Amino acid sequence: TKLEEHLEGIVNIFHQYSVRKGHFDTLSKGELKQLLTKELANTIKNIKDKAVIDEIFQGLDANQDEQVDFQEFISLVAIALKAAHYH
22 is an interface residue for Ca ion by CB under 5 A: yes
User: Across the chain, which distance is largest between two alpha carbons, in Å?
Assistant: 38
Q: What does residue 73 show for φ and ψ, rounded to 5 degrees?
A: -60, -25
22 binds, among a copy of itself, Ca ion, none (CB under 5 to 8 A by kind): Ca ion
Residue 65 to residue 63: CA distance in whole angstroms: 6
Which partner, a copy of itself, Ca ion, none, binds residue 18 by CB below 5 to 8 Å per kind?
Ca ion
46 makes contact with a copy of itself (CB under 8 A)? no
Distances (CA, A) of 83 to 22, 44, 49, 78: 30, 7, 18, 9
Q: Which does 71 bind (CB under 5 to 8 A by kind): a copy of itself, Ca ion, none?
A: a copy of itself
Binding site for a copy of itself (CB under 8 A): 1-11, 13-14, 25, 35, 38-43, 70-71, 74, 77-78, 80-82, 84-85, 87
